[PDB]
Each structure stands twice: as C-alpha cells, then as structure tokens.
Amino acid sequence: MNGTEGPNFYVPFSNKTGVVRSPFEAPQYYLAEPWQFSMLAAYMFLLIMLGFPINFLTLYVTVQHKKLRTPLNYILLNLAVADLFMVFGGFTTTLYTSLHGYFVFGPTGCNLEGFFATLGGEIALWSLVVLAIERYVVVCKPMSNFRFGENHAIMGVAFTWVMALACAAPPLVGWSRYIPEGMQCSCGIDYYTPHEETNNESFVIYMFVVHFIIPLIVIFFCYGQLVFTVKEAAAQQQESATTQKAEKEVTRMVIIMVIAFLICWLPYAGVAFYIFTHQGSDFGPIFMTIPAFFAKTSAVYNPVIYIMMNKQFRNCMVTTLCCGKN
Amino acid sequence: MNGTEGPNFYVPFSNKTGVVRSPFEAPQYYLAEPWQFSMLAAYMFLLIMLGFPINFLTLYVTVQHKKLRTPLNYILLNLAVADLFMVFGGFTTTLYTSLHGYFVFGPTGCNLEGFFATLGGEIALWSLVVLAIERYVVVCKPMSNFRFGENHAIMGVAFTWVMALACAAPPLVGWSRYIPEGMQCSCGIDYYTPHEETNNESFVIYMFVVHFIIPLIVIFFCYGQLVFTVKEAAAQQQESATTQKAEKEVTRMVIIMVIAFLICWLPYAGVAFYIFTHQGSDFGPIFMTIPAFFAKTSAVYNPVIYIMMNKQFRNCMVTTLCCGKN
Ligand SMILES: *[C@@H]1O[C@H](CO)[C@@H](O[C@@H]2O[C@H](CO)[C@@H](O[C@@H]3O[C@H](CO)[C@@H](O)[C@H](O[C@H]4O[C@H](CO)[C@@H](O)[C@H](O)[C@@H]4O)[C@@H]3O)[C@H](O)[C@H]2NC(C)=O)[C@H](O)[C@H]1NC(C)=O
Ligand SMILES: *[C@@H]1O[C@H](CO)[C@@H](O[C@@H]2O[C@H](CO)[C@@H](O[C@@H]3O[C@H](CO)[C@@H](O)[C@H](O[C@H]4O[C@H](CO)[C@@H](O)[C@H](O)[C@@H]4O)[C@@H]3O)[C@H](O)[C@H]2NC(C)=O)[C@H](O)[C@H]1NC(C)=O
Ligand SMILES: *[C@@H]1O[C@H](CO)[C@@H](O[C@@H]2O[C@H](CO)[C@@H](O)[C@H](O)[C@H]2NC(C)=O)[C@H](O)[C@H]1NC(C)=O
Ligand SMILES: *[C@@H]1O[C@H](CO)[C@@H](O[C@@H]2O[C@H](CO)[C@@H](O)[C@H](O)[C@H]2NC(C)=O)[C@H](O)[C@H]1NC(C)=O
Ligand SMILES: *C/C=C(C)/C=C/C=C(C)/C=C/C1=C(C)CCCC1(C)C
Ligand SMILES: *C/C=C(C)/C=C/C=C(C)/C=C/C1=C(C)CCCC1(C)C
Ligand SMILES: CCCCCCCCO[C@@H]1O[C@H](CO)[C@@H](O)[C@H](O)[C@H]1O
Ligand SMILES: CCCCCCCCO[C@@H]1O[C@H](CO)[C@@H](O)[C@H](O)[C@H]1O
Ligand SMILES: CCCCCCCCO[C@@H]1O[C@H](CO)[C@@H](O)[C@H](O)[C@H]1O
Ligand SMILES: CCCCCCCCO[C@@H]1O[C@H](CO)[C@@H](O)[C@H](O)[C@H]1O
Numbered sequence: 240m241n242g243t244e245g246p247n248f249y250v251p252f253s254n255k256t257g258v259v260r261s262p263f264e265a266p267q268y269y270l271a272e273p274w275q276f277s278m279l280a281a282y283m284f285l286l287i288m289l290g291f292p293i294n295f296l297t298l299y300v301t302v303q304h305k306k307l308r309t310p311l312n313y314i315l316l317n318l319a320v321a322d323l324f325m326v327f328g329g330f331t332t333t334l335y336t337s338l339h340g341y342f343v344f345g346p347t348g349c350n351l352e353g354f355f356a357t358l359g360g361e362i363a364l365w366s367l368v369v370l371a372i373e374r375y376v377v378v379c380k381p382m383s384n385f386r387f388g389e390n391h392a393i394m395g396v397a398f399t400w401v402m403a404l405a406c407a408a409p410p411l412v413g414w415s416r417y418i419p420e421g422m423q424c425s426c427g428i429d430y431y432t433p434h435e436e437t438n439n440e441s442f443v444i445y446m447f448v449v450h451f452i453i454p455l456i457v458i459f460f461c462y463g464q465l466v467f468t469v470k471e472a473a474a475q476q477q478e479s480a481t482t483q484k485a486e487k488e489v490t491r492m493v494i495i496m497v498i499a500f501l502i503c504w505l506p507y508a509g510v511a512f513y514i515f516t517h518q519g520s521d522f523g524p525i526f527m528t529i530p531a532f533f534a535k536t537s538a539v540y541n542p543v544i545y546i547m548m549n550k551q552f553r554n555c556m557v558t559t560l561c562c563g564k565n
Numbered sequence: 566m567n568g569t570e571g572p573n574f575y576v577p578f579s580n581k582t583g584v585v586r587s588p589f590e591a592p593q594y595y596l597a598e599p600w601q602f603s604m605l606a607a608y609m610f611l612l613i614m615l616g617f618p619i620n621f622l623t624l625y626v627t628v629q630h631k632k633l634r635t636p637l638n639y640i641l642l643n644l645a646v647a648d649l650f651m652v653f654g655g656f657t658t659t660l661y662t663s664l665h666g667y668f669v670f671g672p673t674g675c676n677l678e679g680f681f682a683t684l685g686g687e688i689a690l691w692s693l694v695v696l697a698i699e700r701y702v703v704v705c706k707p708m709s710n711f712r713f714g715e716n717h718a719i720m721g722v723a724f725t726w727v728m729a730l731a732c733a734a735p736p737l738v739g740w741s742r743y744i745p746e747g748m749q750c751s752c753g754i755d756y757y758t759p760h761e762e763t764n765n766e767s768f769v770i771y772m773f774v775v776h777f778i779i780p781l782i783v784i785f786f787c788y789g790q791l792v793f794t795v796k797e798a799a800a801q802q803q804e805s806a807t808t809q810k811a812e813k814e815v816t817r818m819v820i821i822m823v824i825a826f827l828i829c830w831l832p833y834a835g836v837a838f839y840i841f842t843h844q845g846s847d848f849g850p851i852f853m854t855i856p857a858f859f860a861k862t863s864a865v866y867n868p869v870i871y872i873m874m875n876k877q878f879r880n881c882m883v884t885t886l887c888c889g890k891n
C-alpha cells in the first residue's frame with residue numbers, strides 16, 4: 240500500500256500515519272517539504288518569464304513582417320499558440336497552487352487546468368508532426384504536380400486541433416480522467432492509476448500508440464526521407480559549396496529536432512509504459528513530476544529551436560525589438 | 566516607532582504586538598507572507614539561471630577565441646567576474662535564506678554575503694566607468710602620442726578592484742556596517758539607519774558623492790565627448806553611408822548604456838538620498854527591497870548590453886555553443 244485513493248484523485252503517499260489529505264482540500268507538505276513547493280513555483284516562474292516573451296514575440300513579429308506570413312509558417316504560429324495555452328492554462332495556475340501546497344481550485348478546476356494544459360502540449364506535439372509531413376512533402380515531392388499552399392496549411396493546423404481534442408476531450412467525459420499529478424499541484428491525464436470505471440488501460444494504450452508511436456514514426460520517416468533527398472542532391476552538386484553547407488545545416492537541424500522531440504515526450508511515454516508493464520509499482524510525487532518537467536519546459540526550447548534558429552524570424556525579431564533597425 | 570532595533574540589525578516592522586524576532590534567529594513571516602518569500606526565491610532563481618550562463622559563457626568563449634582577447638576587452642571580462650561574485654555571493658545565498666524566511670547564517674554570514682555581493686556590484690559599477698574612460702581616451706584621443714595597450718587595461722582592472730574595496734571593506738571594520746536589508750534575507754550596506762557608533766551619515770555621503778556622482782559625471786563627460794567626436798567626424802564624411810550608420814549605432818548604444826546605468830543605481834542612490842534628506846521616515850521591507858532588485862538584475866542586463874549586442878562576442882558564442890560552426 241503505497242498511495243491513498245480518493246473519489247477524484249490519487250496521493251502517492253501512504254496514509255498509514257493518518258496525515259494524508261485531499262489534494263483539493265489541504266497542503267501536501269507530507270509528500271514534499273515546503274521549499275520544494277517553492278522550487279516548483281520557481282520553475283513555473285522561469286517558464287513564464289521565458290515562455291511568454293518567446294512565444295508572444297513570435298506571434299507579434301509575424302503581425303509586423305510580411306515575409307514571415309507564408310503558408311509553411313502557419314504551423315509554427317500554431318506551435319506558439321499551443322505554447323501559450325500551456326503558459327496560461329498550466330504554468331500560471333501551477334505557480335499559484337504550488338504556493339498554496341495543493342490544488343486549490345477543486346475538481347472542476349482540475350478539469351479545466353488539465354484540459355487546457357493537455358490541449359496545449361498536444362497541439363504543440365502534432366504541430367511538430369504536421370511540419371515534418373509538410374517539409375517532406377515540399378522537399379521530397381512525393382506527389383506529382385503538387386504545390387503546397389494556403390489551403391493545405393489550414394488543413395494542417397486544423398488536423399492539429401482535431402488530434403489534440405481526440406486526446407484532451409475523452410477524459411472530460413468518461414474515457415480516462417483528470418487528476419492531480421506528482422506533487423498534487425497540477426492536473427494531468429490519469430495514465431498510472433488502474434481505475435477501471437473510466438477505462439484507463441485502454442486510454443493509455445490509445446495514447447501510447449496513436450499519440451506517441453504514430454507521431455514518432457511519421458517524424459522519422461518524413462525527416463529520414465528529407466535528409467536522404469538533400470544528401471542525394473548534394474552528392475550531385477559537389478561543386479557548389481553553398482549546396483554542401485545547406486546539406487550539413489539541414490542534417491544538424493533534423494538531428495536537433497528529432498532528439499528534442501524525444502527529450503520532450505519520451506519520459507511521459509517511457510514512464511507510462513513501465514507502469515503499464517510493471518503492474519504494481521510505487522513511484523513518489525517528485526519522480527512523477529519529472530515527465531511534466533520535460534514536456535512543459537519545451538514551451539521554451541521548441542520556439543528556440545523551430546523559431547529562433549531560423550534566419551528570417553531572428554532578423555525581424557531584432558528589428559521589432561530595436562524599435563527601428565540595428 | 567516604525568521599526569525594531571537590535572544590536573546587529575534593523576527590522577522594518579513595529580514590535581508593539583511582540584511578534585518581531587531577530588532576522589538571524591527566526592522566520593520573518595510577519596513582515597511578508599510566505600509566498601512572497603517564495604517569489605523572492607523565484608527571482609533569485611531566475612537571476613541564477615540566466616546570470617550564470619550569460620556571464621560564464623563570456624569568460625569561456627574568451628578562452629576559446631583569440632580575437633576577443635584584446636586589451637579593450639579586459640574590463641568586460643572584469644564585468645563578468647563581478648557579475649559572478651554577485652551570483653554566488655548574493656543570489657545563491659539569498660535563494661537559500663529566503664526559503665528559511667530569515668538570514669540563517671547569522672551575523673558573520675551577514676558580513677560575508679554582504680561583502681561579496683557589495684564587492685561584486687561595485688566592481689561591476691566601476692568597470693562600467695573605466696570602460697567609458699578607455700573608450701573616450703581611444704576615440705577622442707585627448708592625449709598626444711598615446712596608444713591604449715595591455716598595461717593600461719591592467720591598471721583599469723586594478724583601479725576597479727581598489728574603488729570597490731574602498732566601498733565594501735570599511736563596513737567590515739567600523740565605518741558603516743552590514744545588516745540584513747528589506748525582507749531580512751540578504752545583507753547590504755547600512756545606508757538608512759541613523760546608527761552613529763559606526764558613522765553611517767558620513768559613509769552614505771561618501772558613497773553618494775564618490776561612488777555615484779563621480780561615476781555618473783565621468784560617464785556623461787566621457788560618452789558626451791565620444792558622441793560629439795563621432796558626430797563631428799560624420800558631418801565631415803556625409804558621402805560614406807557606413808560612417809553615417811556607425812554614427813547612429815554608436816549614439817543609440819550610448820543612450821542605452823547611460824539609461825541602463827541609471828536604471829541600475831538610481832534607485833539605490835535615490836532612496837539613500839530621500840532617507841538622508843527626510844530624517845524620520847518609515848519604509849517597509851518590500852519597498853526597501855526594490856533597490857536590490859534593480860542592481861542585482863543587472864548581472865543579467867549588463868552582459869546582454871555590453872557583451873551580447875557586440876557583433877564579435879556574439880559570433881564566437883554561437884560557434885562555441887554549436888560545437889563547430891553554424
Ligand atoms: C487519512 O487518514 C485519516 C485517518 O484515517 C483520515 O482522516 C480522518 O477522516 C475522518 C472522516 O473520514 C475524520 O473523522 C471525523 O472526525 C471528527 C472529529 O472532530 C468527527 O466528529 C467526524 O464526524 C463523525 O461522527 C459524527 C457522530 O455524531 C457523525 O455525525 C459524522 O457523520 C461522522 O461519523 C468524523 O468522524 C477523522 O477526524 C480524520 N482523522 C484525522 C487524523 O485527520 C483521512 O481522511 C485519510 N485521508 C484520505 C485522503 O482519505
Ligand atoms: C519583540 O517583542 C517581544 C516582547 O517584548 C520580545 O520577546 C521577548 O523577549 C524576552 C527576552 O528579552 C523574552 O523573555 C524571556 O521569557 C522566558 C519565558 O519562557 C523567560 O523564562 C526568560 O528568562 C528570564 O527570566 C529568568 C528568571 O529566572 C532569568 O534567569 C532570565 O535571565 C530572564 O530574565 C525571558 O524573560 C520573552 O518571552 C519574549 N516575548 C515573546 C512574546 O516572545 C522580542 O525580543 C522583541 N523583539 C526584538 C527583535 O527585540
Ligand atoms: C508498495 O511498496 C513496495 C515498494 O516500497 C512494493 O514492493 C516492491 O515490489 C515487489 C513486490 O511486488 C518486490 O519484489 C520489491 O522488493 C519491492 N521493492 C522494494 C524497493 O522494497 C509494492 O509492490 C508497492 N505496492 C503498491 C500497490 O504500490
Ligand atoms: C513612523 O510612523 C509614521 C508613518 O506611518 C510616521 O509619521 C509620518 O511622518 C510625519 C511625522 O513625522 C507626518 O507628517 C505624516 O503625516 C506621517 N505619515 C503618515 C502616512 O501617517 C513617523 O514619522 C514614523 N517614524 C519613524 C521614527 O519611523
Ligand atoms: C503540464 C503538463 C502537460 C501539458 C502534460 C501533457 C502530457 C501529455 C499530453 C501526455 C501524453 C502521453 C501519455 C499520457 C502517455 C503516453 C505517451 C504520451 C506522450 C502521448
Ligand atoms: C545584492 C545587493 C547588492 C550587491 C547591492 C549593492 C549596493 C550598493 C553598492 C549601493 C551603493 C550606493 C549606496 C549605498 C547609496 C548611494 C548610492 C550608491 C549607489 C553608490
Ligand atoms: C503570484 C501570487 C500567488 C499568491 C499565493 C498566496 C497563497 C496563500 O497561501 C496560504 O494558503 C494557506 C492554505 O491554503 C493558508 O493557511 C494561508 O493563510 C495562506 O496565506
Ligand atoms: C530522422 C532521423 C534522421 C537522422 C539524420 C541522418 C544522419 C546521417 O548523418 C550523416 O551520416 C553520414 C554517413 O553516411 C556522415 O558522412 C555525415 O557526417 C552525417 O551527418
Ligand atoms: C535550494 C535548496 C534550499 C533548501 C531550503 C530548506 C529550508 C529548510 O526550511 C525550514 O526551516 C525552518 C526554520 O528555519 C524549519 O522550521 C523547517 O523545519 C525547515 O524545513
Ligand atoms: C552621455 C549623454 C550623451 C547623449 C547622447 C547624445 C544625444 C544626441 O542625440 C542626437 O541629437 C541630434 C540633434 O542634434 C539628432 O539629429 C539625432 O537623431 C540624435 O541621435
């Protein structure tokens with residue numbers, strides 16, 4: 240007996256000494272010291288201070304620079320909006336609760352925060368997929384007489400919101416549920432508790448397959464091709480130093496992008512899988528926080544990688560920030 | 566009666582209800598709510614997470630790039646080291662104490678932390694002065710047949726450490742003192758308490774004049790000249806678009822640098838002056854924290870302005886960070 244069950248939640252601490260309380264009703268200072276709640280507040284604060292400017296800046300600079308407003312950029316705009324859902328839905332809420340030491344908004348708040356945070360990171364996730372598809376389509380030209388334009392970009396964005404809803408909506412209404420995670424200050428998808436009234440086991444399998452394996456496969460295929468096409472075109476122009484350079488740059492980028500996706504979701508998927516495999520397991524509140532640390536902090540590193548390492552976006556940002564020019 | 570005096574300290578809260586304790590002995594949760602101590606921890610955490618990389622990166626990239634290692638850069642290296650004194654002396658200590666809710670290292674810790682933090686921000690301050698001198702000397706050439714080289718750079722750096730010691734050493738040994746400030750979690754120079762055994766009034770006057778007015782005057786003169794010289798040289802080459810550009814760039818930079826210096830020290834100087842002028846004053850623990858907020862956060866904005874807006878440093882940083890090249 241390593242936890243304490245409740246109608247709407249699961250505290251990863253044993254109530255044998257009688258001290259465990261509802262994460263909706265009282266401070267959880269028995270599963271982690273107050274300073275650790277503060278450190279949690281500190282990290283949310285960092286994630287807001289960096290996450291907000293980076294992502295808001297992206298939106299804003301696009302409104303101000305025509306050249307950025309191409310169809311192939313729509314998805315990165317989408318990325319930034321997802322990141323903001325995480326910032327205002329997840330990060331700010333967690334900062335507030337962590338300092339109370341429990342999830343003060345009760346179960347319906349737990350649904351709200353869990354939804355918008357989950358919806359955010361999901362849109363972000365599928366955005367990174369759609370992009371890989373779109374890039375591959377544009378570079379490898381797998382369809383004869385096709386030109387990627389506005390309408391497709393819209394489809395890509397919409398597809399992103401549908402795939403996300405297919406994850407974040409079910410728990411609101413019977414298939415899995417939203418319960419406080421880790422240190423009980425923020426709510427996520429119940430992917431660790433055997434709870435059968437809601438059908439957690441089938442949902443976790445659905446998530447693992449449809450929302451992690453499918454995405455991981457599409458990304459590897461799409462970018463595998465992309466790199467192959469680019470490497471092949473350069474072996475056929477070894478006289479252009481430009482072309483050799485672009486090829487190396489495109490390759491380093493893909494490796495960064497792929498590794499970055501793994502860093503972001505492997506822990507959630509990895510932990511989910513272990514807990515599923517090893518039926519009876521005891522993981523603490525801090526351990527169970529690590530998956531969120533990795534995913535959430537991508538609201539910063541994603542736009543650094545996909546937006547700021549881009550030559551164009553960078554220029555406009557500097558212009559917009561320096562009021563005039565240089 | 567707005568405070569509570571003690572042999573080694575001054576708590577900005579009235580002990581009429583009997584709740585005030587030594588900032589060396591017990592949590593000060595009567596002068597600010599625990600969450601506010603956490604927010605204090607949060608901000609120190611931010612300042613470490615940004616402050617350390619920015620400033621360490623500066624040092625490290627210099628070790629790796631010959632072109633950076635010029636005499637006119639020695640002072641910026643010095644700036645970065647000052648910033649690190651603030652990071653390890655001030656920021657980390659404050660993070661630790663803020664979470665205890667009082668200055669747990671006692672009075673001798675109060676001396677240590679107060680010294681290294683003060684020494685840091687002081688070296689930083691005089692570094693920004695010496696640079697203005699050096700630049701003006703190099704651009705305005707006020708001395709016939711003079712070339713700024715290594716030996717001078719060394720003098721500049723040393724002068725910086727002497728001016729700083731002239732500020733941070735006296736309080737250790739009788740002229741003013743170090744006492745917990747604001748929320749009582751960090752120690753600074755006693756510039757607000759009338760305490761006469763140590764001679765606070767003469768020290769504050771010394772600080773205000775020698776360490777704020779002198780610096781502010783030298784910076785305005787030096788850079789005033791610099792801009793004048795550059796503006797004058799360009800009115801005489803209006804056919805070079807380069808030259809007109811450099812002139813605008815040099816002017817925007819000086820305005821940024823000068824404003825930045827004001828933002829950094831005006832609050833400490835301004836508050837110090839008011840309290841001196843208005844003899845009997847009551848300022849709270851949070852208000853009295855604002856001067857440190859402005860100064861400390863310069864461990865981030867100084868290197869952003871003086872190091873990262875520089876074209877060279879930027880290039881090498883990107884090279885060093887991208888393992889190889891671009
Ligand atoms: C973790 O462990 C602790 C202990 O097992 C547990 O906390 C306990 O919860 C029970 C209720 O489930 C509390 O019982 C109450 O105690 C008060 C004493 O002030 C009683 O008056 C309450 O009313 C009862 O008796 C009345 C008789 O007239 C009835 O009218 C009324 O309906 C109730 O029967 C009630 O008995 C108990 O005090 C706490 N114990 C502690 C140590 O706090 C806790 O709920 C467990 N955690 C989780 C997350 O489930
Ligand atoms: C802010 O206000 C409060 C109240 O004014 C003040 O706290 C008080 O400090 C005094 C000591 O200066 C405490 O007095 C002690 O109380 C205990 C009770 O447990 C006594 O036993 C102590 O010993 C005395 O009596 C003994 C007789 O045998 C002597 O041997 C011994 O030497 C002492 O005379 C002592 O009296 C008092 O308890 C607190 N009060 C509270 C409410 O905490 C506080 O110091 C003020 N703050 C600042 C920063 O100065
Ligand atoms: C809760 O308590 C312990 C972990 O402290 C678990 O027991 C471990 O797992 C199996 C028993 O199924 C043993 O082989 C291990 O030796 C135990 N590990 C350790 C480190 O002692 C137990 O399974 C947990 N049960 C639940 C329901 O959470
Ligand atoms: C402490 O208490 C009050 C501030 O709350 C101070 O009184 C103010 O200053 C002068 C009196 O010298 C009055 O003209 C103002 O009206 C008061 N201000 C307010 C807002 O009430 C007092 O001087 C303070 N004294 C010390 C020693 O700290
Ligand atoms: C603040 C925390 C957030 C936004 C967490 C979001 C987490 C997910 C969308 C998790 C997804 C997955 C699982 C539930 C388990 C299997 C693998 C994933 C990554 C698809
Ligand atoms: C963490 C806080 C630090 C490092 C604060 C440092 C503050 C000073 C060196 C303050 C200097 C001044 C005064 C004490 C009053 C007059 C004006 C100044 C700015 C020279
Ligand atoms: C960024 C703004 C965050 C403000 C956080 C304020 C947290 C209030 O924190 C505390 O909650 C406890 C129980 O929940 C109570 O015992 C305390 O009285 C209350 O101060
Ligand atoms: C989605 C996964 C794609 C991984 C990126 C492809 C990695 C190819 O890596 C390349 O391998 C070549 C040898 O064949 C080397 O010559 C190159 O230096 C290296 O960049
Ligand atoms: C980054 C690491 C910071 C660790 C901060 C741990 C703070 C310990 O905080 C607390 O101090 C109080 C009195 O001072 C005690 O009442 C508590 O028992 C103790 O936990
Ligand atoms: C140390 C303080 C130096 C302040 C920088 C000098 C400000 C000069 O500012 C300049 O004034 C000119 C008009 O004479 C304008 O034509 C320029 O646009 C403007 O840059």
Ligand SMILES: *C(=O)CCCCCCCCCCCCCCC
Binds near residue numbers: 561862865869870
């Ligand atoms: C228009 O021309 C204005 C441009 C001036 C911008 C340069 C100032 C750099 C400031 C960086 C500050 C970072 C501080 C973060 C800590 C909270």
Ligand SMILES: *C(=O)CCCCCCCCCCCCCCC
Binds near residue numbers: 495539886887
């Ligand atoms: C050598 O070539 C390696 C270069 C790869 C660097 C690109 C990755 C960007 C990471 C930014 C992460 C910021 C996260 C801050 C939140 C704590």
